[PDB]
């Protein structure tokens, strides 16, 4: 589901165990986030050596949710433990130097399409 006040883990490195979801945005009456939908997020525990700081608000995309992704054929591919990737708002693409979990290729919009070009087997 991933909605307001949701506390979840980051898929990029240096983000630490906890970040909070603070409205979906992008249109009228926007509630809940699906795989590859952009949500607004706040950083709370990030590692001192990382590019990001506490209380500075960013854009992120859902990479793990139990609603999964079904766009390719109608069969649902699902993920355990809600998680998001951190997106650059100006220069585009993800902001880390590593990525956690096995990930997915359905994240195909050109502003984050670089995710298939990383260390994962996808």
């Amino acid at each position: 589901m991933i909605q307001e006040q949701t506390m979840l883990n980051v898929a990029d490195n240096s983000g630490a165990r906890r970040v909070m979801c603070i409205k979906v945005l992008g249109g009228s009456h926007r509630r809940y986030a699906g795989v590859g939908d952009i949500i607004k997020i706040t950083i709370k525990e990030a590692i001192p050596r990382g590019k990001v700081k506490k209380g500075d608000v960013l854009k992120a995309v859902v990479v793990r949710t139990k609603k999964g992704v079904r766009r390719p054929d109608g069969s649902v591919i699902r993920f355990d433990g809600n998680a998001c990737v951190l997106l650059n708002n100006n220069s585009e693409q993800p902001i880390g130097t590593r990525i956690f979990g096995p990930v997915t290729r359905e994240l195909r919009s050109e502003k984050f399409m670089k995710i298939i070009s990383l260390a994962p087997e996808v």
Binding site: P72, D73, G74, S75
Partner: protein
């Protein structure tokens, strides 16, 4: 444009090699008998009078039987006079079936809507309920957004009320043709058809360009 009167049965899936299962609404055709052929004699117009399939007719009245005698020897379902457009539609040659869908891929389907009883407002008309919280009682789902102040004095259809809805003509234009087989007398479309199993489903090709 003539309607083929397909009846409601259900939905199935049909697949492709990319694993996409392709859900499609099923309609099985029996087509028209053709039972009058009007030309010029009444108000200059041309009209076919289609008649669909066959029925048992076990208790018919003489006002119906005297018409079945001039229609043929087997009694069909419905009537539908179907007025023809000049230089656009014809009654000549062989009677037509699913060749109506050989290149036109959008359709329209008329049927009869389901009965909503009370109907109300907060389900049918997308209205908000009042909350049972903060010591609030007695009026949670009861309609009451009907005026101001004394200023309105007369009511327009943007205001919504309870009362019987359903059991009348309803038409949909959302449907896209996925597969047709003239030898299996089959029509498959993407999207859902209104009301109950059986019924009528008048079904004709789209006239929007």
């Amino acid at each position: 444009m003539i309607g083929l009167v397909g009846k409601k049965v259900g939905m199935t899936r049909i697949f492709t090699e990319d694993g996409v299962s392709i859900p499609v609404t099923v309609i099985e055709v029996e087509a028209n008998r053709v039972t009058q052929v009007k030309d010029l004699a009444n108000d200059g117009y041309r009209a076919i009078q289609v008649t669909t399939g066959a029925k048992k007719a076990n208790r018919v009245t003489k006002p119906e039987a005297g018409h079945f005698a001039k229609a043929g020897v087997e009694a069909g379902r419905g009537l539908w006079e179907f007025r023809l457009a000049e230089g656009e539609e014809f009654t000549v040659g062989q009677s037509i079936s699913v060749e109506l869908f050989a290149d036109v891929k959008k359709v329209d389907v008329t049927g009869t809507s389901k009965g909503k009883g009370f109907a109300g407002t907060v389900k049918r008309w997308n209205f908000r309920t009042q909350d049972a919280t903060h010591g609030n009682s007695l009026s949670h789902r009861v309609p009451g957004s009907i005026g101001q102040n004394q200023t309105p004095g007369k009511v327009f259809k943007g205001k919504k009320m309870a009362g019987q809805m359903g059991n009348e003509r309803v038409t949909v234009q959302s449907l896209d043709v996925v597969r047709v087989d003239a030898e299996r007398n089959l029509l498959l479309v993407k999207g859902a058809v209104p009301g109950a199993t059986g019924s009528d489903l008048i079904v004709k090709p789209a006239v929007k360009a």
